[PDB]
Every structure is written in structure tokens, then in C-alpha cells.
Ligand binder design. Structure first.
Ligand SMILES: Cc1cn([C@@H](C)[C@]2(F)CCNC2)c2nc(C(N)=O)cc(Cl)c12
Length: 271
């Protein structure tokens, strides 16, 4: 390609291979993601006939000024793969690596980060998109600005109000009704994953590893965590889907009051 200068490989795995690059016209930092045609779970269609990974359909749906979801800048089709050109914050670290380095997060830091993830998930749902793989590996932190960005819509779907009976996101974030029945609805399955994520932020590891632990849904804390935060987590991890909070109820909960804005968070917590 002559539109982008390719830099180091940043990582590879079920998401494909992702390289650092720069757009040659204006030096903008980008990430260049290659996904093999044989490993794409779902396909969508652009308004015009072109069959594309679902991920491309979903990223176009979520596009706007709103900075909480990674932007798709361009995409290319090759004979055996698709190449996605995405925004790349610089300096950046994903939340998985951040928690690996710092351990359990201070609650004021977790509250700012969790709030920004809820604003990004609400924006996806308002655009008709369900991510289906919310987890710390799929959240990037713009370290200078304190802003978080959701990435990787490769397991996502268009949002619907009937039941889902397929799933290929991350099993330890997936809800008890998926494990037991292979059936879930989108918003309540999303809120269960948010409960897992909030526990991972304030404890430094996820609460469940085994199917039997997910089904029993009993949460224990190894780290000191305030009673209001443990209430929110246990509410989001209610075993009955209809007992979990809506997004409005999460952002109105007492633990979510008084959030730092992203720049304030970067000044206080980010080196
Ligand atoms: C900047 C960046 C880095 N990565 C990956 C190499 C990870 F760091 C690996 C686990 N978290 C993202 C990315 N992955 C994706 C993706 N999976 O869609 C998108 C971006 Cl922007 C990035």
C-alpha cells in the first residue's frame, strides 16, 4: 500500500493481526487490522451489495463525533482477507495491560473508566449495535487525555429485541443464561459483562473462571471494595436477566455519582 506506512506488529490472535501505521497524507497514527476471510464469523452487506465482515457494518453504524468508540477510517478487500484502517491513540495502552501493571484500580479511577465505557456502550446501542465482547482487552486508554475507546466489533451484531442463540465472544464474560440455555437478550447480556468488567477493574482479575461459578453467580472480594461498589457489581451480575439494571439505573446508582471527567482523570492518575 502507498496510502499507509506500516510499522511494528502490535499483536495478533482471534481478532486477526494488528499493525501500527501512519497515514502518509497527514501523518495520522492508525492501526491496520488484517482479518482472514475464512475466520470471519459473520458477514453483513453494505447498502449497495458488497459483502463485508459484520465488523465493518457495525463500525460504520457507530460513526460520529463521539470519541468513545474506535473510528473506522477506511477498509480494503484483498483476495483472502479484509484490511481495516482504524484510529490509533498515541500514547495508548489497553485496559488489560494497564490492570496487569497497576493491579486493582483505585475506585475513583475505576468509576471514571467504567462511566466512560457505559457512555460508549450506550452510544453503540443507540446506533443499533451490540458489541457482545466487552472486556478489558477490548478497551484502549488514550493515556494523555484519560479517554477510553471500545475496539473490536468482530463478535458484535445488530441489536434486536428478540432472543440471540449464537455467541462467539469471550466465555468468562458471558452470562449464566448463555451457559445454561444458549439463549440471551442483548442489553441484559451486556450488563452482565459490565459487571464482570467492573469487578475486574476494582479487584484486578475477573470473578469467575468456570461454568459452574458463572451459573452459581456468587461473587467474593479478595480486595477492599466499598459497599456501594460491591452492590452495583452484584446487581449487574443478577442471575435472572430481568433483575439486572438498565444503563440508566447503573449511571444513577450511588457509586456512579461525582465522576471525574477524562482530562481530570489523566492528570490525577495517568503518570
Ligand atoms: C491499537 C490496537 C492494539 N490492538 C491489539 C494488538 C491489542 F492490543 C491486543 C489486545 N487489546 C488490543 C488493537 N486491536 C484492535 C482490534 N482487535 O479490533 C484494534 C486496535 Cl485500534 C488495536
Amino acid at each position: 500500500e502507498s496510502q499507509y506506512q506500516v510499522g511494528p506488529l502490535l499483536g495478533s490472535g482471534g481478532f486477526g493481526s494488528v499493525y501500527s501505521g501512519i497515514r502518509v497524507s497527514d501523518n495520522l497514527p492508525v492501526a491496520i487490522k488484517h482479518v482472514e476471510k475464512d475466520r470471519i464469523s459473520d458477514w453483513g452487506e453494505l447498502p449497495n451489495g458488497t459483502r463485508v465482515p459484520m465488523e465493518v457494518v457495525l463500525l460504520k453504524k457507530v460513526s460520529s463525533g463521539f470519541s468513545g468508540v474506535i473510528r473506522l477510517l477506511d477498509w480494503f478487500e484483498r483476495p483472502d482477507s479484509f484490511v481495516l484502517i482504524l484510529e490509533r491513540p498515541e500514547p495508548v495502552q489497553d485496559l488489560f495491560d494497564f490492570i496487569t501493571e497497576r493491579g486493582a484500580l483505585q475506585e475513583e479511577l475505576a468509576r471514571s473508566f467504567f462511566w466512560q465505557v457505559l457512555e460508549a456502550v450506550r452510544h453503540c446501542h443507540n446506533c443499533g449495535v451490540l458489541h457482545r465482547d466487552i472486556k478489558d482487552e477490548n478497551i484502549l486508554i488514550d493515556l494523555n487525555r484519560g479517554e477510553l475507546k471500545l475496539i473490536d466489533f468482530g463478535s458484535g451484531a445488530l441489536l434486536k429485541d428478540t432472543v440471540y442463540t449464537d455467541f462467539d465472544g469471550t466465555r468468562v464474560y458471558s452470562p449464566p443464561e448463555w451457559i445454561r440455555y444458549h439463549r440471551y437478550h442483548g442489553r441484559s447480556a451486556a450488563v452482565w459483562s459490565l459487571g464482570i468488567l467492573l469487578y475486574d477493574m476494582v479487584c484486578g482479575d475477573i470473578p469467575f473462571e468456570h461454568d459452574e461459578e458463572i451459573i452459581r453467580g456468587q461473587v467474593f472480594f479478595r480486595q477492599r471494595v466499598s459497599s456501594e461498589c460491591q452492590h452495583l457489581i452484584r446487581w449487574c451480575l443478577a442471575l435472572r436477566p430481568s433483575d439486572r439494571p438498565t444503563f440508566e439505573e447503573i449511571q444513577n446508582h450511588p457509586w456512579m455519582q461525582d465522576v471525574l471527567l477524562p482530562q481530570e482523570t489523566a492528570e490525577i492518575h495517568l503518570h
